[PDB]
Design a protein that fits this description.
The structure is cut from a larger assembly and holds chains A (112 residues), B (50 residues), C (100 residues), D (91 residues) and E (77 residues). Chain A is of the alpha+beta class and 112 residues long. Chain A contains one helix and two strands. Chain A is rod-shaped, with a radius of gyration of 27 Å. Chain E contains two helices and five strands, in the order βαβββαβ. Chain E has a five-stranded mixed sheet with strand order 1-4-3-2-5. The chains are: A alpha+beta (112), B mainly alpha (50), C alpha+beta (100), D alpha+beta (91), E alpha/beta (77). The chains hardly touch. Chain A binds one RNA strand of 403 nucleotides through β1 and β2. Chain A: Belongs to the eukaryotic ribosomal protein eL34 family. Chain A: It comes from Saccharomyces cerevisiae (strain ATCC 204508 / S288c) (Baker's yeast). Chain A: Keywords: Cytoplasm, Ribonucleoprotein, Ribosomal protein.
Chain lengths: 112, 50, 100, 91, 77
RNA sequence: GGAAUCCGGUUAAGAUUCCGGAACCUGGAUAUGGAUUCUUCACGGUAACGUAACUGAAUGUGGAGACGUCGGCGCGAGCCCUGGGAGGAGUUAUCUUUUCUUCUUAACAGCUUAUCACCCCGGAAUUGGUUUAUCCGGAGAUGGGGUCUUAUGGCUGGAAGAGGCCAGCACCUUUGCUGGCUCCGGUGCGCUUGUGACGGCCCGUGAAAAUCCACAGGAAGGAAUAGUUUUCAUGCCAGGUCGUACUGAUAACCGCAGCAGGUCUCCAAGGUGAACAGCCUCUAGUUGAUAGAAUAAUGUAGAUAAGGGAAGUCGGCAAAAUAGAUCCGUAACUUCGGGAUAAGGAUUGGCUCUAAGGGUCGGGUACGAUCAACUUAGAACUGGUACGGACAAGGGGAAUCUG
C-alpha cells in the first residue's frame, strides 16, 4: 500500500511515460520508467516478422554485432526464407521460359 | 514556470535585488528627501506581469 | 521430519534478585502448552525440564519461540512480574529474562 | 435457438430508425459481413476490410470490389463486355 | 557486473594493467542442506567492468590469494 | 517522434544532479589479443537457422520510428489475502499456539526461459485438431523431431559490504563498538497495470519526419616468407549551454482578497457490499473557519404527527410512499426489435447441518491417495414476525397535444 510518483516532469500518462513499479533494495516501492516496446522486423515481401533478427528500438541496431541483425542466406534480414524461396523458383522458371520464348519465335520467322 | 527560460529567470533575478528597503544611510544625506522605498514589490500584492 | 527442537530459557537474572522462581514457571509451561489445541495432551512428545536456572523445552510437536514468549509473557502478567522482567532472545532459540 | 424473428443482424439498432430503413441495412450488412470464396486459392476466406476492399485470409490477396459485396452487378457485366470486345480484336 | 567462471581466465585478468585493485569478500553460507561453509568472492575491478569469481572450496581459495600479483591492492572484506 | 543511470547515503532547505558503488550511450582517436587468409574476403546445419568476429563504395529496395476503439481470454509485475519459522511491541479478572509489525533486492550483464511463426519426416474420410468465442488441414492437418522472437520469468553477478529488525556493552563527548537474524512457502472470476493471441465495429480503416539497420549490387582494396580486417574482447580521451528551490490551491494561480467559485494529470490499503457508491478504519495529513453565556419571537437546515387523505393550490409545488437481491406473474399496443423492473405478489436474520459444482499424481503393450476453492440449492432449530434491520435504493397506471 505504498503509493508512488512519476520521476520526470511529464505528469501525463502518455506513450513515452510508462511506469513499472519495482521494489528497491531500500525496501520501498519506486516507479521506473519503461521505454516503448520494440517491434520485430517485418519481411519486405510478405510482411511477416522474420526470425533470427533481434527486436530492438531502431538506434540500438548500431550497438549490436552483425549476427543479431542477419541470417546466413541471400536476403538475410530483409526477406523471410519463403519469399526468398519463391524468388529463386520465379527467377529460374521465367528466365528459362524466356529461353523458350526466344526460339519459339525463331521458328515463326523461319516459317512465314 | 518551475521549468523556465533564461530570459524569465533573468527578470526575477533583477526583481529579487529590488526587493529591499532603503539603505538607511541614504536618509542622513544632505538635502535627501527620499523617506522610503516607493517602488517596493511583494508577491501577493502586485504581480510582475512577467 | 521427526527432528527435535530445543528452546532454552535463561531465568538466571531474577532468581538472584528474589522476584522469581523457576519451579512454578516450569510447572506453568506443562499445564498450559496446547498440543493439538488441548492442554494436558503433552505426553512425552513435549518435555519441560528445569535445571534450576535454565528452563528448557525439547519439542517434536508444534511449539514455536513465539509461543514460548507468549506463555512467558502470560506467566509474568499473572505474577505481576512485568515492568521488571522482559523476555529477550539472545540467539536463535536461546532466550533470556531481563531484570530492572 | 432462433433468437429473433425478422430483424436478424439489425436487432442491434433496437426499436429505432424506421423499419424500412432497418430492412435496407439488413440487406447489405449481411453481404458485407459474410465470407466469400477466394478466386485464387478456392477457400471461403475473403472478408471486407473497408468499403470496396476485400482481403483473403490465406494467400493474402486483396481484391478490389463493391462496397458491400465482392462483385457488384454492374461490374460483372462490364468484365464480360470487355471480354466480348477483346475477342473481337484477336479474331 | 560480470561473473568470471574460469579460474585461469581470472588470473590473466589481474595482469591486464588497468586492474590496480581487487577485494576478497567472505560470505557465510550453507552447503544446500545442513552445515555452514565459507564461500569467498574474488572481485577485481577493471577499467570498465567488475569481474567476480566465486570460490566455494575454502581450500582452493587459499591457493588463489597466493596466486594474486603482489601489486594488487587487495582489500580483505 | 527521440542515443544513454540505477541503488544506497547525505541537507536547515538540493538531488535520477552531490557522495560511495555499479552501468550504459555518443563522438573521437587508437594498441594488443582473438578471427580470416597458401581455396584469399569464416565455417556448421537437410532446413528453419547458429555464432566472439567473418571486407563491400556509388546506386536501389525494404524494415523500424509508425500508431484506432471496444469486448472477453491467457501470461507477467506490484498490491491484497494467508501458513510455518526467526525478532520486537500490545492484551492478559477470565480467554486467546493470540493482535500488530521486520523478513527487501535496482539499473546493467551472462546462462536459461513463449504464445505466435517457420523447418524436416510423414501423407489424413470412419474427417481430425482446437478456442471462452469455429476456425484450420493435400496450397500438406493430427503426430514425432527441431529453429527463432526474449515481452516476460528463473538462477548467478551487481550484493550484502547496502537497507531492515533486534540484542549486549559503553558515555558531560565528535558519539561509538560488537554480535545475531534478514528464511521457506500457498492461493485467486481478487485490484491496478503492462502484454500476447484474437474477436466486434466503420460510406470513420484511426499522423508525419528526423533517425537507425538490413538486403541487393560488386566499384574497389586486397596475403605466402606474409598481409587483410576494428559491426568480436579489452584498453584511452571528452561530452558544452539553459531549467532544476517551493506551492499547485477552502492561504503560494485567476477571480479588486488569505473569495464556499474556476483550474490539466499520475499513484491508490482493509471491511461491508455488484461496486472507484454510501458508512467505518490503517499509512500519510489536518484538528484550520472570532469566541463565551443563555435557549424568546421570527427565520435557515433537519424531523415527527392522532382521524381524514389533495377537501389546499393555477397546478399534488414541497414532502411522503416505492426501492437491493431471489422466485413467480406480466396487459393493450408494436416499426415484432420492444413495451418490461410493465402491472401485481411471495421470500430475505442468526446458528447447526445436507447436497452439487474442482486441481495434481502413478496404470503393461476398474478406482485411490492428496490439495485448494466461494457459488448455488435444501433441512432442522431459534427470536417481542424480526431480518436489503444503518447505509444505499423505481411510485405506478389510463389517455390527449407535440417533437
Amino acid at each position: 500500500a505504498q503509493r508512488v510518483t512519476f520521476r520526470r516532469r511529464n505528469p501525463y500518462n502518455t506513450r513515452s511515460n510508462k511506469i513499472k513499479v519495482v521494489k528497491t533494495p531500500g525496501g520501498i516501492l519506486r516507479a521506473q520508467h519503461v521505454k516503448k516496446l520494440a517491434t520485430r522486423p517485418k519481411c519486405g515481401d510478405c510482411g511477416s516478422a522474420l526470425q533470427g533478427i533481434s527486436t530492438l528500438r531502431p538506434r540500438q541496431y548500431a550497438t549490436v554485432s552483425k549476427t543479431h541483425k542477419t541470417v546466413s542466406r541471400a536476403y538475410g534480414g530483409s526477406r523471410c526464407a519463403n519469399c526468398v524461396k519463391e524468388r529463386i523458383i520465379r527467377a529460374f522458371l521465367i528466365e528459362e521460359q524466356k529461353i523458350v520464348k526466344k526460339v519459339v519465335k525463331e521458328q515463326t520467322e523461319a516459317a512465314k | 514556470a518551475a521549468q523556465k527560460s533564461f530570459r524569465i529567470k533573468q527578470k526575477m533575478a533583477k526583481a529579487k535585488k529590488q526587493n529591499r528597503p532603503l539603505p538607511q544611510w541614504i536618509r542622513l544625506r544632505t538635502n535627501n528627501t527620499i523617506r522610503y522605498n516607493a517602488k517596493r514589490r511583494n508577491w501577493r500584492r502586485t504581480k510582475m506581469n512577467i | 521430519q521427526k527432528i527435535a527442537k530445543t528452546f532454552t530459557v535463561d531465568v538466571s537474572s531474577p532468581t538472584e534478585n528474589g522476584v522469581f522462581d523457576p519451579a512454578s514457571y516450569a510447572k506453568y509451561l506443562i499445564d498450559h502448552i496446547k498440543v493439538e489445541g488441548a492442554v494436558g495432551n503433552l505426553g512425552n512428545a513435549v518435555t519441560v525440564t528445569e535445571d534450576g536456572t535454565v528452563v528448557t523445552v525439547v519439542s517434536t510437536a508444534k511449539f514455536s519461540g513465539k509461543y514460548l514468549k507468549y506463555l512467558t509473557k502470560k506467566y509474568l502478567k499473572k505474577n505481576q512480574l512485568r515492568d521488571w522482567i522482559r523476555f529477550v532472545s539472545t540467539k536463535t532459540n536461546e532466550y533470556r529474562l531481563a531484570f530492572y | 435457438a432462433k433468437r429473433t424473428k425478422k430483424v436478424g443482424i439489425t436487432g442491434k439498432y433496437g426499436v429505432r430508425y424506421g423499419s424500412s430503413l432497418r430492412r435496407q441495412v439488413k440487406k447489405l450488412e449481411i453481404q458485407q459481413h459474410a465470407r466469400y470464396d477466394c478466386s485464387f486459392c478456392g477457400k471461403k476466406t475473403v472478408k471486407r476490410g473497408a468499403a470496396g476492399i476485400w482481403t483473403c485470409s490465406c494467400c493474402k490477396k486483396t481484391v478490389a470490389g463493391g462496397a458491400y459485396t465482392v462483385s457488384t452487378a454492374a461490374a460483372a457485366t462490364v468484365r464480360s463486355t470487355i471480354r466480348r470486345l477483346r475477342e473481337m480484336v484477336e479474331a | 557486473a560480470r561473473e568470471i567462471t574460469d579460474i585461469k581466465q581470472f588470473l590473466e585478468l589481474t595482469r591486464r594493467a588497468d586492474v590496480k585493485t581487487a577485494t576478497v569478500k567472505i560470505n557465510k553460507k550453507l552447503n544446500k542442506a545442513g552445515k555452514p561453509f565459507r564461500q569467498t568472492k574474488f572481485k577485481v575491478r577493471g577499467s570498465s567492468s567488475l569481474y567476480t569469481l566465486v570460490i566455494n572450496d575454502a581450500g582452493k581459495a587459499k591457493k588463489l590469494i597466493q596466486s594474486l600479483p603482489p601489486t594488487l591492492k587487495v582489500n580483505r572484506l
